[PDB]
Design an enzyme around this catalytic site. Structure first.
Site, short mmCIF file in Angstrom:
data_model
loop_
_atom_site.label_atom_id
_atom_site.label_comp_id
_atom_site.label_asym_id
_atom_site.label_seq_id
_atom_site.Cartn_x
_atom_site.Cartn_y
_atom_site.Cartn_z
N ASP A 147 39.23 49.76 46.49
CA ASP A 147 40.43 49.16 46.93
C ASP A 147 41.57 50.18 47.19
OD1 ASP A 147 41.93 47.03 47.50
OD2 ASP A 147 42.13 46.15 45.62
N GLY A 151 50.27 39.16 42.05
CA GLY A 151 48.95 38.51 42.01
C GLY A 151 47.94 39.57 42.54
N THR A 152 48.49 40.53 43.34
CA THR A 152 47.36 41.52 43.86
C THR A 152 46.94 42.43 42.81
OG1 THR A 152 49.03 43.14 44.65
CG2 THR A 152 48.93 41.36 46.11
N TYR A 153 47.78 42.71 41.92
CA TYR A 153 47.50 43.51 40.65
C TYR A 153 47.04 42.58 39.85
CZ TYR A 153 50.62 46.86 42.83
OH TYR A 153 51.39 47.96 43.78
N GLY A 154 46.58 41.46 39.65
CA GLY A 154 46.25 40.58 38.67
C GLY A 154 47.08 40.36 37.69
C1 LIG Z 1 48.06 49.51 41.15
C2 LIG Z 1 47.22 48.45 39.80
C3 LIG Z 1 47.87 48.30 38.70
C4 LIG Z 1 49.02 48.81 38.22
C5 LIG Z 1 50.15 48.55 39.00
C6 LIG Z 1 51.43 49.36 38.52
C7 LIG Z 1 52.97 49.19 38.89
C8 LIG Z 1 53.71 49.80 38.45
N1 LIG Z 1 55.38 49.56 38.79
C9 LIG Z 1 55.68 48.60 39.68
O1 LIG Z 1 54.86 47.71 40.04
O2 LIG Z 1 57.20 48.62 39.97
C10 LIG Z 1 57.85 47.48 40.46
C11 LIG Z 1 57.66 47.30 42.03
C12 LIG Z 1 59.11 47.90 42.63
C13 LIG Z 1 59.85 47.26 41.74
C14 LIG Z 1 59.30 47.77 40.07
C15 LIG Z 1 59.97 46.74 39.21
N2 LIG Z 1 60.24 45.89 38.44
N3 LIG Z 1 53.62 50.68 37.46
C16 LIG Z 1 52.51 50.83 36.72
C17 LIG Z 1 51.58 50.41 37.46
C18 LIG Z 1 50.37 50.36 36.95
N4 LIG Z 1 50.00 51.52 35.62
C19 LIG Z 1 49.09 49.81 37.07
F1 LIG Z 1 47.69 50.20 36.71
C20 LIG Z 1 47.25 47.38 37.88
N5 LIG Z 1 46.15 46.69 38.28
C21 LIG Z 1 45.69 46.79 39.39
C22 LIG Z 1 46.28 47.57 40.60
N6 LIG Z 1 45.39 48.03 41.89
C23 LIG Z 1 44.62 46.81 41.98
C24 LIG Z 1 43.78 46.30 40.89
O3 LIG Z 1 44.33 45.95 40.09
#
Ligand SMILES: Cc1c(-c2cc3cc(NC(=O)O[C@@H]4CCC[C@H]4C#N)ncc3c(N)c2F)cnc2c1NCCO2
Ligand code: NA
Length: 289
Positions: free
Chosen positions: A132, A21-24
């Site tokens: 953020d 949820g924190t990443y939508g």
């Molecule tokens: C960081 C973020 C991302 C975002 C998250 C990501 C996560 C991952 N990988 C990941 O989460 O891996 C699992 C966690 C450990 C186990 C693994 C399994 N399955 N890879 C690429 C990502 C990526 N390109 C992104 F853009 C998207 N929207 C957002 C935010 N921040 C706040 C605002 O909205």
């Protein structure tokens, strides 16, 4: 910039939702033709959100070659839903990492800080604010590169403001300075520098200062006139350079807080021995111990 007017499902199989949820709405997905993994972020699109405005913002994202920005692989636009296709990180965020590895060494933290500051410098030169910065929003890719996600797009910033409307309440009777302040929300580019300082403490201590106190109480503590910038907990463990980085990043007055570019000349992020081998070490430790 060739926003595809196609269901992304055509090309990708959704495997796992990321972030809780924190990443939508973000998904680990697999390209059907190739075997490749991606991150597909799904930004809900309002009718009001203009598709041309979007096209301007996307082109910026497409032409980015900055080493500290998560890479853009394309985007879809199907049934009032925009999808952004990015690189997928097995290791996830620095939060996902330290929850297994434990606290980062000073050198590991120093490297992460240099790389973020470089990312911030790029964002700020485009008059973008991250807003953020935190462990959870710093991704470590498979090559041990430190990257910020750039979501400088109107529909995304739009969804955050939808939340803030429910927060500030109905606007019709609001004065213009009340409307202006509420929109901005106090966010300025140097807010990212403060947030990084907290992040460094988070990377060092496995949680931000005051994390043991309830958010509401903390909001009050923070906005007390006499509130002091937090510092690192265990004096002995860290060098004066780390303590200083913290002191200067965590300046109360934004008029006296140093920018990304100025901070890139700080002792801590200029020191010898900062290389991605520090991160590869961290990654091996995560996946092995
Ligand atoms: C960081 C973020 C991302 C975002 C998250 C990501 C996560 C991952 N990988 C990941 O989460 O891996 C699992 C966690 C450990 C186990 C693994 C399994 N399955 N890879 C690429 C990502 C990526 N390109 C992104 F853009 C998207 N929207 C957002 C935010 N921040 C706040 C605002 O909205
Ligand atoms: Na990658």
């Amino acid at each position: 910039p060739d926003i595809f007017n196609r269901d992304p499902r055509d090309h990708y199989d959704l495997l796992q939702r990321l972030g809780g949820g924190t990443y939508g709405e973000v998904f680990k997905a697999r390209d059907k033709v190739s075997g490749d993994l991606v991150a597909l972020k799904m930004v809900k699109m309002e009718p009001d959100d203009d598709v041309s405005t979007l096209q301007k913002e996307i082109l910026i994202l497409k032409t980015c070659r900055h080493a500290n920005i998560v890479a853009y692989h394309g985007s879809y636009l199907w049934l009032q839903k925009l999808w952004i296709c990015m690189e997928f990180c097995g290791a996830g965020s620095l939060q996902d990492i330290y929850q297994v590895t434990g606290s980062l060494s000073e050198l590991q933290i120093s490297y992460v800080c240099r790389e973020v500051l470089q990312g911030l410098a790029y964002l700020h030169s485009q008059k973008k604010i991250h807003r953020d910065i935190k462990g959870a929003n710093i991704l470590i890719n498979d090559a041990g590169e430190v990257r910020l996600a750039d979501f400088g797009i109107s529909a995304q910033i739009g969804a955050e403001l939808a939340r803030r409307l429910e927060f500030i309440g109905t606007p019709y009777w609001m004065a213009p300075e009340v409307a202006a302040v509420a929109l901005k929300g106090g966010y300025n580019e140097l807010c990212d520098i403060w947030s990084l300082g907290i992040t460094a403490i988070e990377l060092a201590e496995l949680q931000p200062p005051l994390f043991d106190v309830h958010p509401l109480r903390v909001l009050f503590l923070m906005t007390k006139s006499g509130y002091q910038p937090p510092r690192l907990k265990e004096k002995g463990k860290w060098s004066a350079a780390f303590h200083n980085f913290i002191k200067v990043t965590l300046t109360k007055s934004p008029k006296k807080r140093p920018s990304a570019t100025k901070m890139l000349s700080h002792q801590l992020v200029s020191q010898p021995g900062l290389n991605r081998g520090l991160i590869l070490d961290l990654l091996d430790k995560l996946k092995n111990g």
